[PDB]
Design a protein around this nucleic acid. Structure first.
Lengths: 1049, 117
RNA sequence: GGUCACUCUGCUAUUUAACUUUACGUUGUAGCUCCCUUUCUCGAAAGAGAACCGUUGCUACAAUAAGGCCGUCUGAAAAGAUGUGCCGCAACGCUCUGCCCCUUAAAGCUUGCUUUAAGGGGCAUCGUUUAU
DNA sequence: AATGATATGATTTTA
DNA sequence: TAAAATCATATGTAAAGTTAAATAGCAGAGTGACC
């Protein structure tokens, strides 16, 4: 039963963890254990897009394709049933045999003649397949809207009857094509326009003979062309709604609701403040009674109108209004959007007269608002409220109303509160008067609730942190306390993280330039200019070359003279724990003495508003300091403990949730309320510096554990030791002693435990094994007998396995598989993408040499930029020099040794995801069988193993003469002993062409391999090839052996 | 390590319009000398940053940095025919002995003028 | 009057989750068409006319993950009819089901190991989000 | 514009 | 020459709409600790 603090450095792809044993006074005494869990960010690696978003987009295009095909099949069935075509016209699959491929011509010429069975059917099928866009808005523009509106205006203008006629006349003549091109949106029509064309076509063909203008046919065809499912089912909205603040049973009310709108208006009114002459006051009862009914009586309330109604004055202004903005009082103060919306609907539909109140009950307006906000289809709203209001009103409202956006409070609670607020009480007073003002703790943390954290990346980080927490609890019992350091990147969007990367790169460049300038100013400065020296110079210039405490001029040139100038913490660190740059000032060594642990307000006796305080305040106000810094330096009355806490704790939303959750839902045997503690990153780095652990030069994943260790030693007792030391240092008072450390030789112990090498030199050969590590700690830390114990094992990085059997089937581009007998595919490539290397592989290189030479010359002319070379159109010339036809894409050959059949077995695509590799042994040689996701989908268990030189048909066949050893998934731990070296890593990728494997070194040390990856390990002639098991915490590494070959299922 | 200060005043004289080109040129000349140490001196190609502004550049002498800077400024000003630059020099002692408010005007008054173009 | 956390309102920015459509792009097949390699025919030449095959452009139709299914009615069924028809590249989890690891029993060949069982965990081809 | 990680042709090195 | 390393190169996209939730900044009203 061990007293230990669990430190966690929670990154966006890693969780470093440490266990530090503690005293009876929460003192760090012994480093029990440490490790690093590493995993994949829960986002698309290339773009940062949501994984669920890509999945949803794939699903939605699946639905679109399915429903379009179903629409066309239904239309064919209807054409058969309405006696337009006979069974003779349809092929075995179910398609019309040899239907005319000119439905645009047949459409635009259906205005002049009768149509055959085929021509009519083709026109209908083409109209339904290409049915344009339907405005789904409730009611600045992109290509789609501009094109649709342009075509709508063109056919509405005259000289064109139907969009097909307009299309042929305009688009073909002026473009050379009717349908839209790569990024074009010009030739796009409104669904309303095509429906009009449909009704006109039916009536015209009715007169033009044409037996098949049946009512049934017309109705069916129109229904098929016009109908599409509703975006909101009629149950979605409640399913996404969320509970009330006060009554979790009741759901929150809609904004467009008399009660909720009244609540918003009462909040705004009761919270309004007015500033007259240096004073602040609320609106009086008579002022409030003057304004209350006005938003119902006017379109908008308008702060300026409120001023008019109260006859306020020119000297009186509204609080919280940017009056710099030129017509600040033109802002809407209140607008009963729902009230006036219902009113205007009934007014425009002739059931309401202007200058007359709404005749509907408050409850009725509530019902209308909630129904419209919860339901967006006529059927649903009707079924909900066609029972309780007149149908005329319902028709008007369905014609004109659109409501959204709920108000966080239930109608019940709102109805209780709104009278109480009506009689002049504030919101807090009302709900205090009505309502005044939790979960059992398990041993193991429960799953992180996705409801609270919506960032999937943060969700995965926290889930892996849960895995590590539960691991250390399972292994060592309940922790006494949990200390957390969430990275700055956890909880931010992809763009925010990219922005902070860009800004830190720019900061590195700026610091390089600043060091160069500092060197220019001080040619004889000794050594590299460190951050404190650049900061000294910056503070000099930014303080106008004046001592902040005294105002005496500072002598540049003596800047580096020891003790001449000090970078002082304005607020004492013993009392504030603030090491931010907003608390550092440049003072003369002379004057910053007898200052001690006082603040500028206390040092200069600002309590009595002395001359010195005013002078100091003027100095800091005139300086080039951000407002935050000026506010901090001039901090008058403050709380010691509170300020220490805010600087120590780091209360971003993920940290807040994490602390709350872990403390409330997991057993911790600690002293006092705060048994979960999230650390300020700046203070963690400060302690890291003072405790002796430099920023490691090496690139690997182990430094995370280092951070965790430091977080584990940020105990209240350690913190107060630091506080006492810094207080003494402030008062200048047991000789060179130094910053307090958790224990003697803390730095070296931690460095050896994390990296397996001494602190100084990273070129020592790592203590790869338990006994070697223990020998290293015993030798280098002989004074510390507690450095060696039964839990000391080398840090092995645990990598989250990924044994999912489902994935992308194939790449999304489909290539011609006609010529697959020879190892080639043919893909058709736009000229704006064609390159010399690609051009060498054009199918028609041999046939049409002139075109090839012209293309080559055009690419050479523009330094081989395909976009620039082919910005102006390219044409195939025809013996005599006359440009003939245009070229926009050409067929190119590509190598294709393998692939996946798609599109009714008429196309081929490259593989996407290798889900498994089965490992067999014959004789004393190893064989690998790859299994892709499409093989899993089709249910096929491959039987051919890889041979380097050959294609799959010449591959080694597997039968009962082969032992089956195991199955590898990505990130499975493997051992390869090849009589040249032993390699122990995580299986990353298998190479189909070579038969080699790639393995990641546990810590991804860039020294070994290609950025930590051993690309190209052969296994066929290996002495041993084995698969292992590892746990979160990177412990219990065991060999494992499968009995039978697993199915794909 | 004797420190001087080059005070420059940049303005538009109205005779000829100032191209975005020339604005970026002058901004590049200025920003070559700015860093995080004196990032309040940074120049944008806006009229605000360029037209009618005082900038005091810190320099260590016994180094031809100041002279090259002033030469580039003078060349640009004479080439631009539509932008006026005035350059003064003051010792850093004198400069920090001046009051903070209206410091650059006082430094131009109390310094040695180098060129008015 | 500061600091921190919390409740509500408004504006703004960003993200998360779901849904409904459009329009291209890619492959296949046509129809017409642009070039063009073989080989014929013709021609003083230029270069026409044909037949595979390649292939430019335009228009249409099919497919648009690889793969699985549903409600009803005809049929012995294999199939027909019919549908605003439904799933399928992710995340999380351990209730059920696999695999693997560990621990503990019991029986055994000779303590070591192998089974078998339970318990604990890890991960899934298992479950939930998740459908008619 | 890339932003990443996987799949795999092509080529060089090793034993 | 087979097997094991190394180098190298390709990856579907853009318009429109209806929703709900979460985070954060600012503004306004409070509640609770402290200074």
């Amino acid at each position: 039963s061990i007293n230990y603090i669990l430190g966690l450095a929670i990154g966006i792809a890693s969780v470093g963890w440490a266990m530090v044993e503690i005293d009876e006074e929460e003192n760090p005494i012994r480093l029990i254990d440490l490790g690093v869990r590493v995993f994949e960010r829960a986002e698309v690696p290339k773009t940062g897009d949501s994984l669920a978003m890509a999945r949803r987009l794939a699903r939605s295009v699946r639905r679109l394709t399915r429903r379009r095909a179903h629409r066309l099949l239904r239309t064919r069935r209807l054409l058969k049933r309405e006696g337009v075509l006979q069974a003779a016209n349809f092929d075995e699959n179910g398609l019309i045999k040899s239907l005319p491929n000119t439905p645009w011509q047949l459409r635009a010429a259906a205005l002049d003649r009768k149509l055959t069975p085929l021509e009519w059917s083709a026109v209908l099928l083409h109209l339904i397949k290409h049915r344009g866009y339907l405005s789904q808005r409730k009611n600045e523009l992109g290509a789609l809207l501009k094109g649709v509106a342009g075509n709508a205006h063109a056919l509405q203008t005259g000289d064109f009857r139907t969009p097909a006629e307009l299309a042929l006349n305009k688009f073909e003549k002026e473009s050379g094509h009717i349908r839209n091109q790569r990024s074009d949106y010009s030739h796009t029509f409104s669904r309303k326009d095509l429906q009009a064309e449909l009704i006109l076509l039916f009536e015209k063909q009715k007169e033009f003979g044409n037996p098949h203008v049946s009512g049934g046919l017309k109705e069916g065809i129109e229904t098929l062309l016009m109908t599409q499912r509703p975006a909101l089912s009629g149950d979605a909205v409640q399913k996404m709604l969320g509970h009330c603040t006060f009554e979790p049973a009741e759901p929150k009310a809609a904004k467009n609701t008399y009660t909720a709108e009244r609540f918003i208006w009462l909040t705004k009114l009761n919270n309004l403040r007015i500033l007259e002459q240096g004073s602040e006051r609320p609106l009086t009862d008579t002022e409030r009674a003057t304004l209350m009914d006005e938003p119902y009586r006017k379109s908008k309330l308008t702060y300026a109108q409120a001023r008019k109604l109260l006859g306020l004055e020119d000297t009186a202004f509204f609080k919280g209004l940017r009056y710099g903005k030129d017509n600040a009082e033109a802002s809407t103060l209140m607008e009963m959007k729902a009230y006036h919306a219902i009113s205007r609907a009934l007014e425009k539909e002739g059931l309401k007269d202007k200058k007359s109140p709404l005749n509907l009950s408050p409850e009725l307006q509530d019902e209308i608002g909630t129904a419209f906000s919860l339901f967006k289809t006529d059927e649903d709203i009707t079924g909900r409220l066609k029972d309780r209001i007149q149908p005329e009103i319902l028709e008007a409202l369905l014609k004109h109303i659109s409501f959204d956006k709920f108000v966080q409070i239930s109608l019940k609670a709102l109805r209780r509160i709104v009278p109480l607020m009506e009689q002049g009480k504030r919101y807090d007073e009302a709900c205090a008067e009505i309502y005044g003002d939790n979960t059992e703790e398990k041993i193991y943390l429960p799953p992180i609730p996705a409801d609270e954290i919506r960032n999937p990346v943060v969700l995965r980080a926290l889930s892996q942190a849960r895995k590590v927490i539960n691991g250390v609890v399972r292994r060592y019992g309940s922790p006494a306390r949990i200390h957390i350091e969430t990275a700055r990147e956890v909880g931010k969007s992809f763009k925010d993280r990219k922005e902070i990367e860009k800004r830190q790169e720019e900061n590195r460049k700026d610091r390089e330039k600043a060091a160069a300038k500092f060197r220019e100013y001080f040619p004889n400065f000794v050594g590299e200019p460190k951050s404190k020296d650049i900061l000294k110079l910056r503070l000099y210039e930014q303080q106008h070359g004046k001592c902040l405490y005294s105002g005496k001029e500072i002598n540049l040139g003596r800047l580096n003279e020891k003790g001449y100038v000090e970078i002082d913490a304005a607020l004492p660190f013993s009392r504030t724990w603030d090491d931010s740059f907003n608390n550092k000032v440049l003072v003369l060594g002379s004057e910053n003495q007898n200052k001690g642990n006082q603040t500028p307000y206390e040092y200069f006796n600002g309590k009595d508003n002395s001359r010195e305080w005013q002078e100091f305040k003027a100095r800091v106000e005139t300086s080039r300091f951000p407002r935050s810094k000026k506010q901090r330096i001039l901090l008058q009355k403050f709380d010691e403990d509170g300020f220490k806490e805010r600087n120590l704790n780091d209360t971003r939303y993920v940290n807040r949730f994490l602390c709350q959750f872990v403390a409330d839902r997991m057993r911790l045997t600690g002293k006092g309320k705060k048994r979960v503690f999230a650390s300020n990153g700046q203070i963690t780095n400060l302690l890291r510096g003072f405790w002796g652990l430099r920023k490691v030069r090496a690139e690997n994943d182990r430094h995370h554990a280092l951070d965790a260790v430091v977080v584990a030693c940020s105990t209240v007792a350690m913190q107060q030791k630091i506080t006492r030391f810094v207080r003494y240092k402030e008062m200048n008072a047991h000789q060179k002693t130094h910053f307090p450390q958790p224990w003697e030789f803390f730095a070296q112990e931690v460095m050896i435990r994390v990296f397996g090498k001494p602190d100084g030199k990273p070129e020592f050969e790592e203590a790869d094994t338990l006994e070697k590590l223990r020998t290293l700690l015993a030798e280098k830390l002989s004074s510390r007998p507690e450095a060696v114990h039964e839990y000391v094992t080398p840090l092995f990085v645990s990598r989250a396995p990924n044994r999912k059997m489902s994935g992308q089937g194939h790449m999304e581009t489909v290539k011609s598989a006609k010529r697959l007998d020879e190892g080639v595919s043919v893909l058709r490539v736009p000229l704006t993408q064609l390159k010399l290397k690609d051009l060498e592989k054009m199918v028609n290189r041999e046939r049409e040499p002139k075109l090839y030479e012209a293309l080559k010359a055009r690419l050479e002319a523009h330094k081989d930029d395909p976009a620039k070379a082919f910005a102006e159109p390219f044409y195939k010339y025809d013996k005599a020099g006359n440009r003939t036809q245009q070229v926009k894409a050409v067929r190119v050959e590509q190598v294709q040794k393998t692939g996946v059949w798609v599109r009714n077995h008429n196309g081929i695509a490259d593989n996407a995801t290798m889900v498994r590799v089965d490992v067999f042994e014959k004789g004393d040689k190893y064989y690998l069988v790859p299994i892709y996701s499409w093989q899993v989908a089709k249910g096929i268990l491959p039987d051919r193993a890889v041979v380097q030189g050959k294609d799959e048909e010449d591959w080694q066949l597997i039968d009962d003469s082969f032992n089956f050893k195991f199955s590898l998934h990505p990130n499975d731990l493997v051992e390869v002993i090849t009589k040249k070296a032993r390699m122990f890593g995580y299986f990353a990728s298998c190479h189909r062409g070579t038969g080699n494997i790639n393995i990641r070194i546990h810590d991804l040390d860039h020294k070994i391999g290609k950025n930590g990856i051993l690309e190209g390990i052969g296994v066929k002639t290996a002495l041993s090839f084995q698969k292992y098991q590892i746990d979160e915490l990177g412990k219990e590494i065991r060999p494992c052996r499968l009995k039978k070959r697993p199915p794909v299922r | 390590s004797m420190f001087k200060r080059a005070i420059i005043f940049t303005s538009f004289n109205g005779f000829e319009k100032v191209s975005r080109t020339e604005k970026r040129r002058l901004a590049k000349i200025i920003n070559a000398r700015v860093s995080i140490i004196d990032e309040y001196l940074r120049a944008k190609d806006t009229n605000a940053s360029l037209d009618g502004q005082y900038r005091a550049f810190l320099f260590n002498d016994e180094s031809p940095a100041m002279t090259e800077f002033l030469a580039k400024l003078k060349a640009f000003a004479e080439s631009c025919t539509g932008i006026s630059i005035d350059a003064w020099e003051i010792e850093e002692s004198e400069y920090v002995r001046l009051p903070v408010e209206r410091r650059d005007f006082l430094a131009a008054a109390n310094g040695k003028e180098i060129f008015k173009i």
